[PDB]
Amino acid sequence: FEGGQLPLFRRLPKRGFTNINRKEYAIVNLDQLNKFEDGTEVTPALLVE
Amino acid sequence: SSTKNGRDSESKRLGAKRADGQFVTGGSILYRQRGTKIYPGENVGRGGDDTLFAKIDGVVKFERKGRDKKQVSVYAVA
Amino acid sequence: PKMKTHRGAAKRVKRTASGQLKRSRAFTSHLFANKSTKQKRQLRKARLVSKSDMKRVKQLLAYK
RNA sequence: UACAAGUAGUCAGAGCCCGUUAAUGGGUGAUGGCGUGCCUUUUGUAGAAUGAACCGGCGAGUUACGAUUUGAUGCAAGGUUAAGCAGUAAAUGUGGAGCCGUAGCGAAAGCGAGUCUGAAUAGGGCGUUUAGUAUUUGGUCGUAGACCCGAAACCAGGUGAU
RNA sequence: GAGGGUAGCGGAGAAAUUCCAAUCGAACCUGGAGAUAGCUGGUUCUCUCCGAAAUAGCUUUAGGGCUAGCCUCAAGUGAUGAUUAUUGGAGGUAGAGCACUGUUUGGACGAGCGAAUUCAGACAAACUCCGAAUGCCAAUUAAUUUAACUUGGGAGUCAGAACAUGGGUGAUAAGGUCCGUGUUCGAAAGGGAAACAGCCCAGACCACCAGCUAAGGUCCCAAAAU
RNA sequence: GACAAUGGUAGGAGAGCGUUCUAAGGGCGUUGAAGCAUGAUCGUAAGGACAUGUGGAGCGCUUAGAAGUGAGAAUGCCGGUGUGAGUAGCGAAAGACGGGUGAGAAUCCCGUCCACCGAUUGACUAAGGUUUCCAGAGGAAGGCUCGUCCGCUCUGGGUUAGU
RNA sequence: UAGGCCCAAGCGACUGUUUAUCAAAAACACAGGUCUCUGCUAAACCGUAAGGUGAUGUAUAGGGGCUGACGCCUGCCCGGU
RNA sequence: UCCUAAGGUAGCGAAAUUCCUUGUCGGGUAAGUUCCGACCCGCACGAAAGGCGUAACGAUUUGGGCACUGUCUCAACGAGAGACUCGGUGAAAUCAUAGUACCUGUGAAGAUGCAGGUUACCCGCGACAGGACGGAAAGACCCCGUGGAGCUUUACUGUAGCCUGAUAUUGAAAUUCGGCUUUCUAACCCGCACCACUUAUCGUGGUGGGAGACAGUGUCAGGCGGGCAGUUUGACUGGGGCGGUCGCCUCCUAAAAGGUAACGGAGGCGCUCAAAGGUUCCCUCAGAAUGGUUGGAAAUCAUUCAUAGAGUGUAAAGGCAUAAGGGAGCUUGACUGCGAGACCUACAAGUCGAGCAGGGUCGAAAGACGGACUUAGUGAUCCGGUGGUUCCGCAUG
């Protein structure tokens, strides 16, 4: 906006903060594991490959 | 010279928000008023400010509360 | 070059799953003796940015 | 063409002079009807509101990097390269750091097809569509002078008492 | 007369904002620099379909913006749209009336009695014992018709005018000014009103030396009845 | 075939004309290319051909690609040419005649008369200008007219210090 | 070739200066008056450093403000600045 | 008699000053808003931004006389230069194209070009100036722009300079209570003298005098500071200025749904209540007449009529006698987490709400209670303060 009345992002308050030590995990579902044959070992070294 | 008038207030929007014989839900506003101009009938309540709302689902009927008196009712039709 | 992001807007909204924006409420900073109990209970629930305002500030938050 | 009141044309039309990209042809015009230039700006202009003497040349939405949307094409729970190396300043191989999507909710710890609020999914909010991704034609926006021409002014460094 | 000095955030002035190279309320040249301009002007080829607005809110705002209304293109849902015919309903305008609050005319009523009581006759946007014609909301009801709604790309508009009608203001003045409701112009050529945007009739795809009509007309200009 | 629709400012959407360059394919041209002029020709529009004159060496056609791609207006910029119009003016002032030169004479040379300044229109010199000074030739341009003339053109010359 | 004169009034005493190019005046200046600062590396001013003017002067001398020949004079108020 | 620091002295006065005003009287002229002399009722003279006078002076401003005259009654004639005809040479402003009449109308409201009528054969030359809203100058007057520049001040924020204190350069001795004051010389200073570099006192060095831990200079702090610099100084408005207004609530205008303007017509609000809230019981007003120690037959005693004319905390409207009006008992629901649906609406906001769960008050019970008969009593964000908390907290606690 320019001039005029107060902008929308000026009449609303700020909310929350952010965490420096935030951890994010890569999620793998059960259905995605059907590719590997039964009776085999699954390792993070194998899911990436 | 000058003047001493010119002030006013924003117009409040009262009246009948529902028509006679119209299906309404369980919280619809039927009438907005100051004081009592239309009395609550069956399945009709009253608010803080004098307003009429339905309690159940059905048609809206405006009836006669004797002489020079009025009421609105809601009947559980279908 | 690269388009810049409104830093003030990034401190007030968050993007939902369907691309909408989740905002907070106003009129809650002080002067709480001049408001009814029902008013203050219902001012603690978050809202969504309206479609009219969305058409105006969509370019401001493009990397968010 | 020297009795005539004209935005100068158009429609109708005798008379006179010629003969074509050969077609129900060309040049001129005694008379009759209709008819107050063009552009800009305005509620409204023949306007006595602005602009142009005339002719010729030059004279104004473009490019780079990002965002979104539409169409085309390749692959598909996957899609795809960057800098660098080789190669003709060459269009092609290598290069998987990286980026988007496949899962959301919460200020956060955190939980997870379910999360937050809440004593209590008791109710309510946002999710469970769980098909995208790389390039490119067109439309629009942002950062750069950003469609073009036009100030009264400000700052810095110098030149002047013929 | 000749040779010299004082330089612009500065000099000189027996003082006028006077002079400093025909220029001075702050000299000239070159750079920042294509300064900024919510302001005037200009913006180059041709055809087909559709087609506005001059409004509300906010605004250091009033000849500028933003959101909403109205226009256009594409993809979606599928009677949800408009007009009539029959019932139901909310809402006190025109008119009328004096039962309330106020105004007022003339007679009986001593407590001065045209109003402390009574009988007749009048007035009112901020009076009502009463109360239309229209307009408005619905039915899940019947004939006719063709539109409505949602999500996305792109806009323009925020100076309006006249006429008819209900009002305020003015002076029952204005081609005056501000509101409600329609038509036209705006953005509409053709015919009538002598000429004359808004009045009356009527909405131009192109061509013809064909016919019937509207508004207004038929003695001559000038087509039609002396 | 049958029906229905097609006035339009701001503005939205679609199909097209023309100019310059590039790739590929295929053509024309000294028995005459582009450009220029005329014509009574063709398509719904922007526009496309053919013939004849001039011209003297390059240029179209088809499909794609790219853009410094289209002009009547901005008191627009540059060049050319009109109207005012044979109109205003030709910058203080006294000339007349005879003889020559000459293609050409009111305006050039020679002689006579008249006229004007004379505390200056006379004689020197400082600043400033830099060859405008002299002789012999010339008449395009300069001279607010003419010119055989010139502070104008050509060719040659000219400034001498112990005070 | 070579002064027109006279009688009254307002302003400024006078001789002088000023808006080159629409104002020459009652406007500025002026001799005189008054107040105030300055004891000398003086006060005042430029540069705000050196170095200079004042001044190669010394309170009968310098800078600044206001009035403006000459004659008669110049009253009251120290709350406010 | 009131107030103040005291209330204008001497002089002058329809004045370079007097709106009313051409004030009143006298003089001057046949006739005098101008001129001179007096009066004082000085809108609004006044004593060094001086008062009252004054010989001489002035291309200064005013009023009246003599002489003179073409300044006029009232114009006429003559000379020269331009103008006019011929020969030579030869521009400019302006310009949409032009075969360019008048009257009455019409029109963006003042026509060569539009309607009706009336006049007028084609082309030149010398003259005049009514129109072509005639030609040069993008109106300096008025208004607008969140445009410039110069100037002022007790507008705001700064600053050049100036004043004051602490500290370093900065030493050495003594007095009553970490210091004040008084002495001394080596630091430092002298546009103070003599000597040398040097025929120069600019400079440097040396020798004598003066002042002296003072002054001058560096860093930090307080005060004065239009001398100077950068900016601000609102909008609506029957042009602008002046006056008035700006947010909220209740009526009329407003055309019986909702909405609807004007510097149109009327009023309020920026609170209050600890019971003036909730629940359970009980009750019905104002006014009029009559009677008795007569104050308004209405200051209280008593009777009758009396559907509202009374009350409802505060303006108005809509309501309320099933009371929402008056009285009494108990009590704190003027609670916590929510909330299907709906009204209004550009957004941000605003309004009502049945029901679910956790504590409860009153009532025998069904039930009522999330402030007051309803509608005004209110201000986004940023920043800061206080109380609580499974939250985070930059290698680790």
PDB file of C-alpha atoms (C1' of nucleotides) in Angstrom, chain G:
ATOM      1  C1'   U G   1      24.741  84.335 -28.588  1.00  0.00           C
ATOM      2  C1'   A G   2      22.830  86.120 -22.897  1.00  0.00           C
ATOM      3  C1'   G G   3      17.502  85.948 -15.807  1.00  0.00           C
ATOM      4  C1'   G G   4      10.401  86.220 -16.295  1.00  0.00           C
ATOM      5  C1'   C G   5       8.874  88.608 -11.640  1.00  0.00           C
ATOM      6  C1'   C G   6       5.781  88.802  -6.878  1.00  0.00           C
ATOM      7  C1'   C G   7       2.695  87.254  -2.373  1.00  0.00           C
ATOM      8  C1'   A G   8       1.634  83.031   1.282  1.00  0.00           C
ATOM      9  C1'   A G   9       1.840  77.640   3.272  1.00  0.00           C
ATOM     10  C1'   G G  10       4.061  72.021   4.285  1.00  0.00           C
ATOM     11  C1'   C G  11       8.783  69.178   4.523  1.00  0.00           C
ATOM     12  C1'   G G  12      14.322  68.896   4.824  1.00  0.00           C
ATOM     13  C1'   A G  13      18.922  73.381   7.890  1.00  0.00           C
ATOM     14  C1'   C G  14      22.933  73.821   4.028  1.00  0.00           C
ATOM     15  C1'   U G  15      27.137  72.163  -0.272  1.00  0.00           C
ATOM     16  C1'   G G  16      26.644  66.583  -1.399  1.00  0.00           C
ATOM     17  C1'   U G  17      24.546  60.658  -2.584  1.00  0.00           C
ATOM     18  C1'   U G  18      21.038  56.972  -4.486  1.00  0.00           C
ATOM     19  C1'   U G  19      17.321  52.106  -7.515  1.00  0.00           C
ATOM     20  C1'   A G  20      23.418  51.221 -14.895  1.00  0.00           C
ATOM     21  C1'   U G  21      17.919  50.290 -18.237  1.00  0.00           C
ATOM     22  C1'   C G  22       9.883  53.217 -15.811  1.00  0.00           C
ATOM     23  C1'   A G  23      10.743  56.351  -8.868  1.00  0.00           C
ATOM     24  C1'   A G  24      16.313  61.970  -7.746  1.00  0.00           C
ATOM     25  C1'   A G  25      12.359  62.765  -3.464  1.00  0.00           C
ATOM     26  C1'   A G  26      10.163  64.619   2.410  1.00  0.00           C
ATOM     27  C1'   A G  27      14.735  59.016   1.131  1.00  0.00           C
ATOM     28  C1'   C G  28      20.758  58.300   2.499  1.00  0.00           C
ATOM     29  C1'   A G  29      24.935  61.189   4.092  1.00  0.00           C
ATOM     30  C1'   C G  30      26.476  65.415   6.930  1.00  0.00           C
ATOM     31  C1'   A G  31      28.819  69.093  11.344  1.00  0.00           C
ATOM     32  C1'   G G  32      26.504  68.948  16.361  1.00  0.00           C
ATOM     33  C1'   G G  33      24.240  66.011  20.756  1.00  0.00           C
ATOM     34  C1'   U G  34      23.882  61.653  23.765  1.00  0.00           C
ATOM     35  C1'   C G  35      24.559  56.578  25.841  1.00  0.00           C
ATOM     36  C1'   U G  36      27.689  52.319  26.180  1.00  0.00           C
ATOM     37  C1'   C G  37      32.402  49.140  25.860  1.00  0.00           C
ATOM     38  C1'   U G  38      37.975  49.426  25.954  1.00  0.00           C
ATOM     39  C1'   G G  39      44.517  50.171  30.668  1.00  0.00           C
ATOM     40  C1'   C G  40      47.259  48.021  25.583  1.00  0.00           C
ATOM     41  C1'   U G  41      49.339  40.808  23.312  1.00  0.00           C
ATOM     42  C1'   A G  42      43.364  46.904  24.672  1.00  0.00           C
ATOM     43  C1'   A G  43      38.036  46.461  23.005  1.00  0.00           C
ATOM     44  C1'   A G  44      35.887  45.397  17.907  1.00  0.00           C
ATOM     45  C1'   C G  45      36.534  42.423  12.974  1.00  0.00           C
ATOM     46  C1'   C G  46      39.018  38.360   8.870  1.00  0.00           C
ATOM     47  C1'   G G  47      41.339  33.585   9.263  1.00  0.00           C
ATOM     48  C1'   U G  48      38.789  31.280  13.621  1.00  0.00           C
ATOM     49  C1'   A G  49      46.340  28.337  13.280  1.00  0.00           C
ATOM     50  C1'   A G  50      50.387  31.053  11.986  1.00  0.00           C
ATOM     51  C1'   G G  51      50.029  35.918  10.469  1.00  0.00           C
ATOM     52  C1'   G G  52      47.323  40.840  10.090  1.00  0.00           C
ATOM     53  C1'   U G  53      43.717  45.570  10.397  1.00  0.00           C
ATOM     54  C1'   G G  54      42.827  48.589  14.684  1.00  0.00           C
ATOM     55  C1'   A G  55      47.930  51.668  14.854  1.00  0.00           C
ATOM     56  C1'   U G  56      53.407  51.792  13.743  1.00  0.00           C
ATOM     57  C1'   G G  57      47.591  55.035  17.633  1.00  0.00           C
ATOM     58  C1'   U G  58      47.383  55.143  23.971  1.00  0.00           C
ATOM     59  C1'   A G  59      41.029  57.444  27.355  1.00  0.00           C
ATOM     60  C1'   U G  60      41.080  65.390  24.528  1.00  0.00           C
ATOM     61  C1'   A G  61      42.395  57.725  21.812  1.00  0.00           C
ATOM     62  C1'   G G  62      39.698  53.842  19.476  1.00  0.00           C
ATOM     63  C1'   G G  63      34.638  50.343  18.319  1.00  0.00           C
ATOM     64  C1'   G G  64      29.150  50.228  18.484  1.00  0.00           C
ATOM     65  C1'   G G  65      23.558  52.034  19.068  1.00  0.00           C
ATOM     66  C1'   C G  66      20.151  56.298  18.561  1.00  0.00           C
ATOM     67  C1'   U G  67      19.083  61.433  17.095  1.00  0.00           C
ATOM     68  C1'   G G  68      20.537  64.958  13.407  1.00  0.00           C
ATOM     69  C1'   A G  69      22.636  73.438  11.736  1.00  0.00           C
ATOM     70  C1'   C G  70      20.754  77.125  15.286  1.00  0.00           C
ATOM     71  C1'   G G  71      17.060  79.008  19.553  1.00  0.00           C
ATOM     72  C1'   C G  72      13.681  77.383  23.845  1.00  0.00           C
ATOM     73  C1'   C G  73      13.288  72.905  26.039  1.00  0.00           C
ATOM     74  C1'   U G  74      12.813  67.425  26.861  1.00  0.00           C
ATOM     75  C1'   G G  75       7.407  65.795  32.029  1.00  0.00           C
ATOM     76  C1'   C G  76       5.458  60.861  34.976  1.00  0.00           C
ATOM     77  C1'   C G  77       6.378  55.155  35.728  1.00  0.00           C
ATOM     78  C1'   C G  78      11.851  50.211  37.844  1.00  0.00           C
ATOM     79  C1'   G G  79       5.421  45.912  37.934  1.00  0.00           C
ATOM     80  C1'   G G  80       7.099  42.902  32.932  1.00  0.00           C
ATOM     81  C1'   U G  81      11.968  42.252  29.471  1.00  0.00           C
TER      82        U G  81
END
